[PDB]
Structure 1
Amino acid sequence: MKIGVFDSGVGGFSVLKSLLKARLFDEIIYYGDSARVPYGTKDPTTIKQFGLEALDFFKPHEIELLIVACNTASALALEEMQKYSKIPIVGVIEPSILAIKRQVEDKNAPILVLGTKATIQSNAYDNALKQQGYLNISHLATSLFVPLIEESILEGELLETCMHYYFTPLEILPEVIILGCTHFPLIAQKIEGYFMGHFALPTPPLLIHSGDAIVEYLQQKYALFPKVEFHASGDVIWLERQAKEWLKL
């Protein structure tokens, strides 16, 4: 097929990478609203309007299916968007819950949800999880991880001090951690390392990657080479430059 991938900026590249890795589609129209990014710190009303406007961007491209790669957008604007689209719009939250259900049998396993303040406050992960029968659910808005990852601070004392800042107030010891944000996969190993150490874990907690989850899901739902076209709200060449580092083979 020919699809569109939407995100607030360059975070969506973590989804795009999984999409390319799988060779699921022949044409992908990537669009990042890099001029208004980030969404996670904004309000619900606003993100919803951004959502609608994103649809308008794809009207001329005529895609068969739109993937809302942004977790913040999937959480607060996927419904309204789907409500005005003729084509199917798949967010990243839904696929992750299927991913969890498929590999976590113990309904008591401690699950920690990570994401932006907007994502967390919408409680989209918690509701979908509870509905599926999970009883031990925690959530944390790790805002600073986004700007940190964007400055490319993927190691060192600043990241460690930042992770320590958000994690220390943690009560539960998670067996599952949801990277409910486009950025978090770039520091997934650092997060695993933090919990493995601070809790003398034998193995790292299971990490749920949004990109990998959507892919599996898309292969499932549509029993399934890769040519991308980049579009941005802000300087597009600036965005294309990021793809190089994020998508890194």
Structure 2
Amino acid sequence: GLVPRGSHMMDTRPIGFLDSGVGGLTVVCELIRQLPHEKIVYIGDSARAPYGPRPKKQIKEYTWELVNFLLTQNVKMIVFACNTATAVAWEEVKAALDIPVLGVVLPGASAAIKSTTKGQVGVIGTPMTVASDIYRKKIQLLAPSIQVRSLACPKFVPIVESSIAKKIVYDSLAPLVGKIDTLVLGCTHYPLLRPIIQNVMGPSVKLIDSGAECVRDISVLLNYFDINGNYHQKAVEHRFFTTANPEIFQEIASIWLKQKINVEHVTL
């Protein structure tokens, strides 16, 4: 990609995102807001969700299909937005690919480590993510002495897709109130409930948005690897794929991205 009226060539490839559903779209929203000039290719494998309870073998197998589909789309980078896919095959995919491979869990974990005051970290997410305990594992793999308390908030995802909402958050986070100094939003759906969560936890707790942290890593890594696009070139050629139920996918997508986005249904 030659810069118009310019002299240098800049990468024109898009950044790829894989997920077993629509939650990852919030990481996509963060990308658009921070790096408006970067193209996106999103593949949501809802047809085989939930990944969570399935055997590692299948998860590795499904993840790779998502990876290869992204590669056929000529992506310069791949972002894991699915917690289970990240826990099971993120490591091997990253070691094998020739392009940068990132996840959302890692930067959220790291930011928690760097932001805690007394060493009391909280993690809220889905029963599955809390069940895998992946955030605590990543956090403690780097700083084993950090105390991590993880709580499932099963009413959160439904609320995302009102005074009742307020009550629900207050009751769901109650067990955490006053017991931590840092809280990881361990579900990509939760960034939409941030203001209420901040209100329930009080000003004494710092909120860590894993998706935003991840998007910050993307910015530094694109530059580090010299695959950044022209900063003045607004991007719009965004591709969205799903392996199932495109109707609701477009519903949720159009809403969060605040623009009618077009979803393409595909078969892997």
Equivalent pair of 1:24/1:226 in contact (CA under 8 Å):
yes
Which residue identity does 1:66 align to in structure 2?
I
Please name the residue that 2:85 is paired with.
73
Once the two structures are TM-superposed, the CA of residue 52 in structure 1 deviates from its matched residue by 2.2
Structure 1 residues 195 and 13, CA gap change in structure 2 (3 angstroms): same
Please name the residue that 1:160 is paired with.
167
Structure 1 residues 171 and 76, CA gap change in structure 2 (3 angstroms): farther
Please name the residue that 1:183 is paired with.
189
Please name the residue that 1:22 is paired with.
34
Aligned length: 235
Equivalent pair of 2:177/2:201 in contact (CA under 8 Å):
no
Q: What do the CA deviations read for 1:147-186 (whole angstroms, capped 9, x no partner)?
A: 3322xxxx4326623651x434448622211011111111
The CA distance in 2 between the partners of 1:133 and 1:24, in whole Å, is 37
The percentage of counterpart residues that share the same residue type is 31
Please name the residue that 1:146 is paired with.
157
Please name the residue that 2:179 is paired with.
173
Aligned partner (choices 123, 141, 147) of residue 136 of structure 1: 147
Once the two structures are TM-superposed, the CA of residue 91 in structure 1 deviates from its matched residue by 0.5
| Aligned residue runs from structure 1 range 91-102, under 5 A | 91-102=103-114
| Aligned residue runs from structure 1 range 192-231, under 5 A | 192-196=198-202, 203=203, 205-223=205-223, 225-227=234-236, 228-231=238-241
Once the two structures are TM-superposed, the CA of residue 17 in structure 1 deviates from its matched residue by 0.8
Aligned partner (choices 14, 17, 27) of residue 2 of structure 1: 14
Structure 1 residues 226 and 44, CA gap change in structure 2 (3 angstroms): farther
Equivalent pair of 1:192/1:204 in contact (CA under 8 Å):
no
Once the two structures are TM-superposed, the CA of residue 129 in structure 1 deviates from its matched residue by 2.0
Equivalent pair of 2:63/2:85 in contact (CA under 8 Å):
yes
CA RMSD of superposed structures (Å): 2.7
4+ residue stretches of structure 1 with deviation over 6 A? none
Structure 1 residues 86 and 221, CA gap change in structure 2 (3 angstroms): closer
The CA distance in 2 between the partners of 1:26 and 1:179, in whole Å, is 25
The CA distance in 2 between the partners of 1:20 and 1:134, in whole Å, is 36
| Aligned residue runs from structure 1 range 47-62, under 5 A | 47-62=59-74
Once the two structures are TM-superposed, the CA of residue 190 in structure 1 deviates from its matched residue by 1.9
**Structure 2 residue runs without a partner (length 5+):** 1-12, 229-233, 260-268
| 1:110 counterpart = 2:116 | no
Equivalent pair of 1:48/1:76 in contact (CA under 8 Å):
yes
Structure 1 residues 47 and 103, CA gap change in structure 2 (3 angstroms): same
Structure 1 residues 235 and 161, CA gap change in structure 2 (3 angstroms): closer
Equivalent pair of 1:48/1:80 in contact (CA under 8 Å):
no
Equivalent pair of 2:25/2:253 in contact (CA under 8 Å):
yes
Once the two structures are TM-superposed, the CA of residue 16 in structure 1 deviates from its matched residue by 0.5
Once the two structures are TM-superposed, the CA of residue 209 in structure 1 deviates from its matched residue by 0.9
| 1:241 counterpart = 2:247 | no
Q: What do the CA deviations read for 1:125-162 (whole angstroms, capped 9, x no partner)?
A: 22332223553221122234223322xxxx43266236
Larger Rg: 2
Q: What do the CA deviations read for 1:35-88 (whole angstroms, capped 9, x no partner)?
A: 333445x33535433322211322321211111122333233312433553322
Equivalent pair of 2:109/2:210 in contact (CA under 8 Å):
no
Partner secondary structure for residue 29 of structure 1: strand
Equivalent pair of 2:126/2:153 in contact (CA under 8 Å):
yes
**Structure 1 residue runs without a partner (length 5+):** 197-202
Partner secondary structure for residue 222 of structure 1: helix
